[PDB]
DNA sequence: GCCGGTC
DNA sequence: GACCGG
DNA sequence: GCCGGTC
DNA sequence: GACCGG
């Protein structure tokens, strides 16, 4: 983590800062603590000025920096890695269509919130904003499927030392008119026990967990994580297939005439 | 529908309205352009003051005009419909601890955006906003599971004419700084083919479709719709069960 | 006191 | 809540 | 058209 | 994206 060494420097500048309320609307989804994210980001951009990127912002550089490369075919070679490509790419049309006059913008599917790159190594930083003024279910963290596929690309292409998935939790509450932050937590994904990882099928098959509570007790290799998690995925997958007939079939097969 | 009769008047008032972009940043997800839903409530509230309600506003009004009744126990009995209950009611401890000094507020998963009750008949209206500047996928309309459980209750209790589930799609486009409505569409769920509905199992098991695309040529009866939806549901389920294995298992086993 | 459904 | 297609 | 993952 | 319990 390029952010870990300065986690403190970040935790401080955040806790206690007062931002305006989210358009005075539903503090839900992509509107909860938006401001904080831009906050954490601007911070890094000032501190880690040369390592800090925003997924798309990053892509636009990768391409702009290689002006002579046109056509999705060659541009996809600008990644120099299947796995990494899988996680940051934009699709045939979008890629082929790219241009200095048709720059990439923010997309809802974008994997990471912030990209920190240095020495052929990438840190995919994703922030989770929690309305601490209550106690809710575990937030969608990332796709179990996109995770499973990512692992497979890892094993195959054998890129066990390329990227890192880290989560920065930003707890905020509504103190008066502003949206103040009260706490912050950090955690590495591949530093967690994959067999523990909870996969909520309905919840967009996303694995869910509060950064704060995320277990960081894993002492194996990244190649071992990929392999173990992938096994975890398969079992739970089958398992859900079973629970799906019980819950969504049996009790209704009685109304089916 | 109580809206239907005046939809054309609504379409006129909604089309042309503008709303300032949230933080001017990324306008997508939950809060993408949903602030339009308010404009619907606002308008609906002025033209239909006595029917227009907010799910919570309706619940609070229900409890407010029954002071003699307290405790979740008796409170849930005020609905007089196991179905409406399941669809509208709030949580037990939430119902228990209710009072003017502590009213119901906006919950993220309330079944409806607007309630227009009238004469024991309920029309649970939902507003759906779309960024017309693109060809996005159909949005989540409502859980297939919740819909299923609702279809099962209509049966068991014979409530085949108590409520309705309609949808109002409101299309917009960015006009520089604020978003501006450019169209609208109204569709009833129970008037569509209970079997052609597409169940997106990954997306909260939601039923997805662009309101403008949904049909309205169901000539059968509510009881039939229900019986047919369940059949459709119970089948898709089995499918997803199979498919899930071929897409999330088969291709990965070569790694354990 | 884990578990997971819904906008 | 509502998003396009490496 | 049809299908369906993912913030 | 992020929400609790009819």
Swiss-Prot record, chain A:
SUPFAM superfamilies: Restriction endonuclease-like (SSF52980). The lineage of its organism: Bacteria, Pseudomonadati, Pseudomonadota, Gammaproteobacteria, Pasteurellales. Its EC number is 3.1.21.4. The gene is hincIIR. One of its GO terms (molecular function) is DNA binding. The keyword Oxidoreductase does not apply. It catalyses: Endonucleolytic cleavage of DNA to give specific double-stranded fragments with terminal 5'-phosphates. Pfam families: Endonuc-HincII (PF09226). CDD domains: HincII-like (cd22329). InterPro entries: DNA_rep_MutH/T2_RE_sf (IPR037057), Restrct_endonuc-II-like (IPR011335), Restrct_endonuc_II_HincII (IPR015307). It comes from Haemophilus influenzae. This is Type II restriction enzyme HincII. Keywords: Endonuclease, Hydrolase, Nuclease, Restriction system. One of its GO terms (biological process) is DNA restriction-modification system.
């Amino acid at each position: 983590s390029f952010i870990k060494p300065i986690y403190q420097d970040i935790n401080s500048i955040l806790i206690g800062q007062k931002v305006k309320r989210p358009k005075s609307g539903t503090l839900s989804g992509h509107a909860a603590g938006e401001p904080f994210e831009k906050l954490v980001y601007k911070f890094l951009k000032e501190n880690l000025s040369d390592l800090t990127f925003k997924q798309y912002e990053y892509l636009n550089d990768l391409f702009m920096k290689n002006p002579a490369i046109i056509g999705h075919e060659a541009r996809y070679k600008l990644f120099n890695s299947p796995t990494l490509l899988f996680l940051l790419s934009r699709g045939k049309a979008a890629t082929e269509n790219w241009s200095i006059e048709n720059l990439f913008e923010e997309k809802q599917n974008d994997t990471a919130d912030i990209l920190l790159v240095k020495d052929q190594f990438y840190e995919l930083l994703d922030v989770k904003t929690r309305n601490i003024s209550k106690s809710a279910q575990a937030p969608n963290i990332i796709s179990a499927y996109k995770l499973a596929q990512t692992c497979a690309k890892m094993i195959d292409n054998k890129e066990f030392d390329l990227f890192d998935i880290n989560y920065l939790e930003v707890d905020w509450e509504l103190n008066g008119e502003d949206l103040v932050c009260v706490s912050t937590s950090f955690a590495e994904l591949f530093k967690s026990e994959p067999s523990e990882l909870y996969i909520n099928w309905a919840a967009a098959m996303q694995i869910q967990f509060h950064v704060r509570d995320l277990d960081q007790g894993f002492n194996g290799t990244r190649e071992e994580w990929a392999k173990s998690y992938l096994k975890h995925f398969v079992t739970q997958a089958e398992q859900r297939a079973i629970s799906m007939i019980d819950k969504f079939v049996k009790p209704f097969k009685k109304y089916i005439l």
